[PDB]
Design a protein around this ligand. Structure first.
Ligand code: UDP
Ligand code: UDP
Ligand code: MG
Ligand code: MG
Lengths: 393, 393
């Protein structure tokens, strides 16, 4: 079996969580890697942005990323990429003609890639599996246009792969999706890498990151974009220091795009530390160093960060949003906050900070909870999904 | 020979000059009709917007318009149509598969259609002839994205068909075009329909349009969009009435999108009359009724309106912009104004209004000048262009 994955506007090779790269990229790369271990051949198609990479990047046996030239390597934001939809498709057409490569199935990611997938699937006469990741309908002409495209894929994809049951309901309510075409594919997290793991490990991580050993740490991990609510953490941390100015608390934000500006405007610069984004092998230390990972998203998911933090034995305080209530077991492995008021977040942070016995237990339980998430699981589900889709054409 | 013309965002069947429909539509329809008379089979592909029309409209022998469904019949402006580029292409792919129809050549119109054309031409292995009509480079992310697409077509189309030599220079300067790929195809105007024509014809037209027989008329014809400068006519007419409040002058604007609001704000409502847009068989009367057609474009062309007015024996006062200096023979069949100051336009209008002998002569000469423009000409040039393109593949 050879699968063409389409990830047009962002590449699985781009460092997550700056820029346009986040959980979807790690989702695409992680599943693809697992599929490739299982002997399924995957090529991930993406728009060429870094020419030093070449056209074909060989990631592992059975796994390639294909960098397709379509418009300039830069100066084209995600909002303008619809203008490249036909060029990118044409780019994929030539590459496959040149390489004489044939696919059994296409799995598209995000509405841009789905529009490409929809054309390719009719041309190649093979099934299209589509994963939305996020959706307009969950108020401008641009969002209206995206919604319309998202509606087209709902109506035309052979299988709509969603990441939770809540997204399935979302598809059915906001897009009138046929429930027979929807399939829940639960996501994973790299649970071997993100792990507690060892009695001295938290403190080893603190030494490595230059964090004081006797202090409480809240971490935010991910893209620094308003929809992710890092401003909520910063504002809540300000409130905490209004209540008790010498609270033993340091914050790490880790993190690519000003939020430092907001932090100094609120007087909390010296207790907040902004870390550059780093590969998973290095992120572990942020998770382990942390007593609490705060994830104040306005929109989401699953919530890969919530899962990775859990896997690493660190309780999460999450917004009651997207996949987060499924990623976090409320009251057992963390807390869920309603809304994004600094006051409500201060409350939730304070209750986990000041109750050691509870917080420690959540962290230990978070590990047990997170082992239910299993990229290799995820791929096993996709593999079946692919086999059925192929069998029914 | 069977040619697929692509006109994605606007249909040759849409009434010119409201909305998104103007000279390009009449260019597409007029050439296609002439090509079809010459035994060349043309299908014009467009986005479906009026379902009462059906999928295939049979216009004449050898001429069809194909309405391709891609996104909703409405609620999608031209700016958001890039989001439909892959759906529209996919739509064309299915239609041709269903109908088992094969093309010798593609002639695309406007950058959207060219992006579709570029993908189709590699797939079908046939030449792409592209006509830009207008160009971004002749300052927002959206215009930057369009420019980039326009640059891609310059680099990839087999023939760049332009409408004047000035556009050729524009292609070469702003887009680094290869001069070997550029071919000037001079446009036409329906010179039999738009004609003087008969000694009592001007006055017959005035009776028909309810215009007083003893008055001077300036007409503006075309889409009421700021880039067309109808505001310039309105402001200039205001200036004329500041200089001499009982000047014998009436204005007809004809015309789809407020400019009536501007007119009342300036005190000139009662001398200005706004006409709904009408088919060519009815527009003739506007041209004949007129003593002067003012065309204060900020961007253009050729300038089909300038040509049609000339053909109908009516002098033109045009902005020195786009194709207008070629469409109008300065000092012989009309005047050219530099810039768009009401004062400069008042001057130019006043000199043609108050000098009958000159104006009458220009009108007579305008006829002789306009017969150099010849849709059947235009098509003869395209026909050769197509034959060469086919011969070189
Ligand atoms: O320094 C960093 C911070 C972020 N991440 C990754 O970025 C992803 C962000 O996931 P999240 O679900 O929060 O982002 P979103 O779903 O909003 O795209 C996670 O997988 C992190 O491992 C990373 O690799 N390095
Ligand atoms: O009531 C009207 C007014 C406009 N036109 C047509 O609209 C076109 C507008 O041409 P122009 O070159 O001025 O528009 P543009 O090039 O800006 O698209 C001309 O062919 C006119 O015949 C028309 O058919 N009916
Ligand atoms: Mg920890
Ligand atoms: Mg006249």
């Amino acid at each position: 079996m050879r699968v063409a994955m389409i990830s047009m506007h962002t590449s699985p090779l781009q460092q997550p969580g700056t820029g346009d790269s986040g959980g979807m990229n790690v989702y695409i790369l992680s599943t693809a890697t697992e599929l490739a271990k299982q002997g399924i051949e995957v090529d991930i198609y993406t728009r060429a942005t870094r020419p030093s990479q070449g056209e074909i990047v060989r990631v592992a046996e059975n796994l390639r990323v294909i960098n397709i030239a379509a418009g300039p390597y830069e100066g084209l934001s995600k909002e303008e990429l619809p203008t490249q939809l036909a060029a990118f498709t044409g780019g994929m057409l030539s590459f496959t003609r040149r390489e004489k490569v044939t696919y059994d199935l296409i799995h598209s990611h995000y509405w841009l890639s789905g529009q490409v997938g929809w054309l390719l699937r009719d041309l190649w006469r093979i099934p299209l599996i589509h994963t939305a990741h996020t959706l307009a309908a969950v108020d401008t002409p641009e969002s209206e246009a995206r919604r319309i495209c998202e509606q087209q894929l709902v109506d035309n994809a052979d299988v709509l792969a969603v990441n939770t049951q809540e997204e399935m309901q979302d598809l059915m309510h906001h897009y009138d999706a046929d429930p027979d075409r929807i399939s829940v594919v639960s996501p994973g997290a790299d649970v071997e890498l993100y792990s507690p793991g060892n009695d001295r490990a938290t403190e080893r991580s603190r030494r490595e990151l230059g964090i004081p050993l006797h202090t409480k740490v809240v971490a935010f991990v991910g893209r620094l974009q308003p929809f992710k609510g890092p401003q909520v953490l910063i504002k809540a941390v300000a409130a905490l220091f209004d209540r008790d100015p010498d609270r033993n608390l340091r914050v790490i934000i880790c993190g690519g795009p000003t939020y430092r500006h907001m932090a100094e405007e609120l007087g909390v610069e010296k207790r907040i530390r902004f870390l550059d984004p780093r590969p998973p092998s290095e992120l572990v230390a942020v998770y382990r160093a942390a007593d609490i990972v705060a994830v104040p998203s306005f929109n989401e998911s699953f919530g890969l960060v919530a899962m990775e933090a859990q896997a690493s034995g660190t309780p999460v305080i999450a917004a009651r949003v997207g996949g987060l209530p499924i990623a976090v077991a409320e009251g057992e492995t963390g807390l869920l906050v309603d809304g994004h008021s600094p006051h409500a977040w201060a409350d939730a942070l304070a209750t986990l900070l000041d109750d050691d016995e509870t917080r420690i237990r959540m962290g230990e339980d978070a590990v047990e909870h997170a082992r239910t998430f299993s990229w290799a699981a995820t791929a096993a589900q996709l593999s079946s999904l692919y086999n059925d889709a192929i069998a029914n054409e």
